[PDB]
């Protein structure tokens, strides 16, 4: 295709539905309780971030520990004496608690993370609340 790329509302809807289909999972599935999330790779050359299928009824922190297994990636989170892979906002460092669930925040008044959003995974201690700047690493 070409002709640049116009900007409109429909473009977001089509792009969203098209992305969910690419996300690691089933397209035919109802995905009524499960939502797709864009995880930012640490050193993803070809791609900066990859979509992943997650459940709304899953701990925010645990979501990472699980995704690491399903994706078959290397990371020391099961232990305690070692940095654990966790999700946090880009250019913020603020890392939500693992006891909190996605549906909880999404359903809550705040609702910081919305459907089709983006998130990055970095090695951060459980006790650690605010991590360094991720942008610095991807600079």
Curated annotation (Swiss-Prot):
GO biological process, alphabetically ordered: cellular response to arsenite ion; positive regulation of intracellular protein transport; stress granule disassembly
GO cellular component annotations, sorted alphabetically? Answer: cytoplasm; cytoplasmic stress granule
What is a GO molecular function of this protein? zinc ion binding
Which controlled-vocabulary keywords does the entry list? Acetylation, Cytoplasm, Metal-binding, Repeat, Zinc, Zinc-finger
Q: Where located?
A: Cytoplasm, Stress granule
Stretches the record annotates as ubiquitin-like: 31-131
Where does this protein chiefly localize?
cytoplasm
Report whether Zinc shows up as a keyword of the record: yes
What UniProt notes about the protein's domains is: The ubiquitin-like region is necessary for its localization to stress granules (SGs) in a VCP-independent manner. The AN1-type 1 and 2 zinc finger domains are necessary for the recruitment of the 26S proteasome to SGs. Both the AN1-type 1 and 2 zinc finger domains and the ubiquitin-like region are necessary for efficient SGs clearance upon specific arsenite-induced responses.
What this protein is reported to do is described as: Plays a role in the regulation of cytoplasmic stress granules (SGs) turnover. SGs are dynamic and transient cytoplasmic ribonucleoprotein assemblies important for cellular protein homeostasis when protein production is suspended after acute exogenous stress. Associates with SGs and is involved in the efficient and specific arsenite-induced clearance process of SGs through the recruitment of the ubiquitin-selective ATPase VCP and the 26S proteasome.
What does the subunit comment say?
Associates with the 26S proteasome; this association occurs upon exposure to arsenite and is reduced in the presence of ATP. Interacts (via AN1-type 1 and 2 zinc fingers) with PSMD1; this interaction is increased upon arsenite treatment and occurs in an ATP-independent manner. Interacts with PSMC4. Interacts with PSMA1. Interacts (via its ubiquitin-like region) with VCP; this interaction occurs in an arsenite-dependent manner and is necessary for the recruitment of the ubiquitin-selective ATPase VCP to stress granules (SGs).
- This protein is called AN1-type zinc finger protein 1
Protein's organism: Homo sapiens
Gene name for this UniProt entry:
ZFAND1
Placed within the complete protein, the shown segment runs: 133 to 268 of 268
